[PDB]
């Protein structure tokens, strides 16, 4: 037999180490000698969670909550649910603990986080970077950037090498293309730096570039950056997926064994986890989009079905199937399926209908596209609409219409933007026309 | 070669807006790119410590 104060002394020691492996055999010991000690139940989950083994740690926290009792492991049972991938539990954990504490609210600012509740978790986060202090402020300043630029990229909200991507990557969602990349070369000069001072967190800078590439339209660079990307291996899962999709994107129809081997990649272990519900939602929108192009029509459906199934959160994929439709020489089908979404819903509507009108200039039926095109309110004012309008008008000679049409859209814009560049290019133009044919 | 959608603040008679390629959409829709997500770093980690021993120590 040995001393139980001197197993104690020598547990603080290994963890004082840092060894956590011998340090839990040890409290296995102790708890051995003495069941009903709470101290040594905590340690030994403190040590499961350290170790990688959140399974057993959470076994441990249900099967000795009856002996527990008292002040109750709340934030390491949520720590161990939240490492599982268990975030609405972790929801109730943090809410039901008996008192608010700094692990706790730390915590509860990375689950709000994991759900995209990004009001509460940026409020939440702001709390902890003013009224904490510790030795990761950087890391929380970084996690508070992060939030703000995840929040910009996806719900639109105008707001080291880490901060540096993070305000890279708020810029993309501003939608700033060449700053952007002008302060991803900053943070790959500083990548470059505390790296010689390991390759795959350079990957990552690089994802950002070549995203910005396609989306400035410079596609041929792009592609070489993405395949030195992918040729590099990175240990990121999230990010290949990234990666792949943004592939297929560039790839579009052309390069159809990049394509396969890409989303070979962009379903693999772990990736549902990493990734935003925007991010999984449009790679589910590229996947039908894929389909249709190289792949048989009969999982083209399923996809595209399987996201409308989660249609309802954003970005209408109905296209998808509507265009399908269309390939399938169908295209009242097309409509139908168009028109009922439109009456649907009315937030929706405008931008949809646009859609509707393309298919009626296929071979005919023009009237009734312009008399779509106008039933698009609060954009039927605009120059481009109104020209193309004015155009298709002119086609079966519906002048008197066209002229109203001038009219209405010079009363909107004096009404709202008197003197507007675009609203005196309308009345010039109009004059023009009323010139023309009297 | 833009469709409409892109062209909307720009008043211009394209006569293909009346022919067989108006081009007011893009059909098939374009594909989707994301950006990569930002950076994110565990935090609560780091707060996983043992209790304050010194009470039940040697």
């Given at each position: 037999?040995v001393?139980?104060?001197?197993?104690?002394?020598?547990?603080?020691?290994?963890?004082?180490?840092?060894?956590?492996?011998?340090?839990?055999?040890?409290?296995?010991?102790?708890?051995?000698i003495?069941?009903?000690?709470?101290?040594a139940?905590?340690?030994?989950?403190?040590?499961?969670?350290?170790?990688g083994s959140?399974?057993?740690?959470?076994?441990?926290?249900?099967?000795?909550?009856?002996?527990?009792?008292?002040?109750?492991?709340?934030?390491?049972?949520?720590?161990c649910?939240?490492?599982?991938?268990?975030?609405?539990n972790?929801?109730?954990?943090?809410?039901?603990?008996?008192?608010?504490?700094?692990?706790?609210k730390?915590?509860?600012?990375?689950?709000?986080?994991?759900?995209?509740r990004?009001?509460?978790?940026?409020?939440?986060?702001?709390?902890?970077?003013?009224?904490?202090?510790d030795?990761?402020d950087?890391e929380?300043?970084?996690?508070?950037?992060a939030?703000?630029?995840?929040?910009?990229?996806?719900?639109?909200?105008?707001?080291?090498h880490?901060?540096?991507y993070?305000?890279?990557?708020?810029?993309?969602?501003?939608?700033?293309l060449?700053?952007?990349?002008?302060?991803?070369?900053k943070?790959?000069?500083?990548?470059?730096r505390?790296l010689?001072?390991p390759?795959?967190?350079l990957?990552?800078?690089?994802?950002?570039?070549?995203?910005?590439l396609?989306?400035?339209?410079?596609?041929?660079?792009?592609?070489?950056?993405?395949?030195?990307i992918?040729?590099?291996?990175?240990?990121?899962?999230?990010?290949?997926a990234?990666?792949?999709?943004?592939?297929?994107?560039?790839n579009?129809?052309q390069?159809?064994?990049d394509?396969?081997?890409?989303?070979?990649?962009?379903?693999?272990?772990?990736?549902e986890?990493?990734?935003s519900?925007?991010?999984?939602?449009?790679?589910?929108?590229?996947?039908?989009?894929?389909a249709?192009?190289?792949?048989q029509?009969?999982?083209?459906?399923?996809?595209?079905a399987?996201?409308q199934?989660?249609?309802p959160?954003?970005l209408?994929?109905?296209?998808?199937?509507?265009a399908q439709l269309?390939?399938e020489?169908?295209?009242?089908?097309?409509?139908?399926?168009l028109?009922?979404?439109?009456?649907?819903?009315?937030?929706?509507?405008?931008?949809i209908?646009?859609t509707?009108?393309?298919?009626?200039?296929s071979?005919?039926?023009?009237?009734?596209?312009?008399?779509?095109?106008?039933?698009?309110?609060?954009?039927?004012?605009?120059?481009?609409?109104?020209?193309?309008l004015?155009?298709?008008?002119?086609?079966?000679?519906?002048?008197?219409?066209?002229?109203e049409?001038?009219?209405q859209?010079i009363?909107?814009?004096?009404?709202?933007?008197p003197?507007?560049?675009?609203?005196?290019?309308?009345?010039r133009?109009?004059?023009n026309?009323?010139?023309?044919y009297? | 070669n833009?469709?409409?959608?892109?062209?909307?603040?720009?008043?211009?008679?394209?006569?293909?807006?009346?022919?067989?390629?108006?081009?007011?959409?893009?059909?098939?829709?374009?594909?989707?790119?994301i950006?990569?997500?930002?950076?994110?770093?565990?935090?609560?980690?780091?707060?996983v410590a043992?209790?304050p021993?010194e009470?039940?120590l040697?």
């Amino acid at each position: 037999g040995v001393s139980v104060p001197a197993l104690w002394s020598e547990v603080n020691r290994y963890g004082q180490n840092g060894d956590f492996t011998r340090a839990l055999k040890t409290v296995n010991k102790i708890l051995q000698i003495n069941k009903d000690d709470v101290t040594a139940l905590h340690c030994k989950v403190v040590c499961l969670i350290q170790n990688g083994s959140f399974k057993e740690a959470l076994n441990v926290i249900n099967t000795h909550t009856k002996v527990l009792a008292n002040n109750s492991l709340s934030f390491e049972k949520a720590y161990c649910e939240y490492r599982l991938n268990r975030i609405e539990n972790a929801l109730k954990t943090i809410e039901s603990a008996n008192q608010q504490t700094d692990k706790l609210k730390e915590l509860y600012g990375q689950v709000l986080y994991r759900l995209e509740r990004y009001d509460e978790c940026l409020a939440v986060y702001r709390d902890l970077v003013r009224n904490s202090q510790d030795d990761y402020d950087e890391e929380r300043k970084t996690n508070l950037s992060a939030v703000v630029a995840a929040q910009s990229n996806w719900e639109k909200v105008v707001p080291t090498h880490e901060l540096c991507y993070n305000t890279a990557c708020a810029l993309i969602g501003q939608g700033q293309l060449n700053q952007a990349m002008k302060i991803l070369q900053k943070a790959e000069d500083l990548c470059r730096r505390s790296l010689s001072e390991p390759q795959a967190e350079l990957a990552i800078i690089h994802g950002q570039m070549a995203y910005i590439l396609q989306l400035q339209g410079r596609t041929e660079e792009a592609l070489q950056l993405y395949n030195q990307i992918i040729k590099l291996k990175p240990t990121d899962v999230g990010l290949l997926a990234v990666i792949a999709n943004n592939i297929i994107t560039i790839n579009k129809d052309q390069n159809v064994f990049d394509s396969k081997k890409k989303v070979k990649l962009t379903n693999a272990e772990g990736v549902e986890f990493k990734l935003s519900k925007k991010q999984l939602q449009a790679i589910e929108f590229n996947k039908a989009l894929l389909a249709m192009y190289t792949n048989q029509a009969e999982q083209c459906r399923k996809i595209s079905a399987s996201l409308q199934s989660q249609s309802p959160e954003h970005l209408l994929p109905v296209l998808i199937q509507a265009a399908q439709l269309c390939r399938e020489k169908q295209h009242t089908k097309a409509i139908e399926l168009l028109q009922e979404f439109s009456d649907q819903h009315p937030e929706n509507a405008a931008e949809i209908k646009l859609t509707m009108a393309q298919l009626k200039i296929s071979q005919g039926n023009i009237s009734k596209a312009c008399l779509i095109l106008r039933s698009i309110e609060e954009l039927k004012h605009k120059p481009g609409m109104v020209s193309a309008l004015v155009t298709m008008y002119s086609h079966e000679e519906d002048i008197d219409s066209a002229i109203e049409v001038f009219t209405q859209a010079i009363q909107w814009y004096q009404n709202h933007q008197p003197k507007s560049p675009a609203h005196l290019s309308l009345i010039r133009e109009a004059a023009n026309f009323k010139l023309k044919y009297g | 070669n833009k469709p409409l959608v892109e062209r909307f603040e720009t008043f211009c008679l394209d006569p293909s807006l009346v022919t067989k390629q108006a081009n007011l959409v893009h059909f098939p829709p374009g594909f989707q790119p994301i950006p990569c997500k930002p950076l994110f770093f565990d935090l609560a980690l780091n707060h996983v410590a043992f209790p304050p021993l010194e009470d039940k120590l040697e």
